[PDB]
Design a binder for this molecule. Sequence first.
Ligand SMILES: Cn1cc(C(=O)N2CCOCC2)c(C(=O)Nc2cc3nc(-c4ccccc4)cn3cc2C#N)n1
Ligand SMILES: [Mg+2]
Ligand SMILES: [Zn+2]
Length: 313
Amino acid sequence: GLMQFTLPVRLCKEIELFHFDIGPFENMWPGIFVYMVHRSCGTSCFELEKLCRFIMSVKKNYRRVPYHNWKHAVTVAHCMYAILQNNHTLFTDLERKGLLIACLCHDLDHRGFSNSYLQKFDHPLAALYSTSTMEQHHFSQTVSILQLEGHNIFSTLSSSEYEQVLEIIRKAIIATDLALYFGNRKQLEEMYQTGSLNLNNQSHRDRVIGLMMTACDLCSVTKLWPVTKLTANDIYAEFWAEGDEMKKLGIQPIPMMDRDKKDEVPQGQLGFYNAVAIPCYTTLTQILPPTEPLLKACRDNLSQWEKVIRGEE
Ligand SMILES: Cn1cc(C(=O)N2CCOCC2)c(C(=O)Nc2cc3nc(-c4ccccc4)cn3cc2C#N)n1
Ligand SMILES: [Mg+2]
Ligand SMILES: [Zn+2]
């Protein structure tokens, strides 16, 4: 009960910054996650024994894929922790509880393939879930793990609080479908600019939490250039393997997934920062002003990608 997780000094300070990299030591990531729940949510939010057992079941259910792996899940939870800690009073007790859990679970049992490849492959999951296929799977895996004996970290919540936290988690994980991000940001943009954006309207909150999930999910672009550049390599390792599988089905993949178009990567990144990342962190900064460092870091990494094209690195 009076057992506070602490981290070494360098981690203790840098884990508060948006650009923190969780490091290459896999065995510290669980404790990094508990530290963030204890500081963000409180040391009373979860029974430590149920949480530690939930985390190791979630770890065991991520695959050894190059990018959509356990390290991605903890990276995404850290970004959310940073947003929650810089926006302390704006969020409910259930929201802080649910959103760090949602982030840790948002890519559960990912295979390293897009919703598109499952649909073209005709995967069973594509029959069961026709849209946001992997994301409905990720939420279904999350419910499965909570229902393992000893694993219900929400045991102490009332029946109504329970249904509300699982609804937050569900919307949170569905929101990580990048296909739903474009329409979600446009509506938030309109509601902020016109001026009807209302954090008491539950449908409005959902949209904000949605944008935060995209923000945390894309957060490789808000890191130190070497982290951003090396994560990119793991992102393209999955995309090019999907490209190979597409070719095996007799379908030329989109250039993004074609290893034969590596040369065009720097230009593909410009598109992504301009079409997806920068709009995401801009609307996020407009709605939640203290998330500005994500936007500053993102603009910095777009500038680094322009230098690659100019041949200066
Ligand atoms: C952090 N983080 C997350 C993602 C990401 O997208 N997702 C998360 C992982 O799951 C699928 C979604 C990226 C990213 O790099 N995204 C894209 C890269 C890209 N390269 C080309 C390209 C390359 C060569 C030639 C032409 C185009 C196109 N193009 C589109 C993209 C998008 N969107 N970075
Ligand atoms: Mg995902
Ligand atoms: Zn993800």
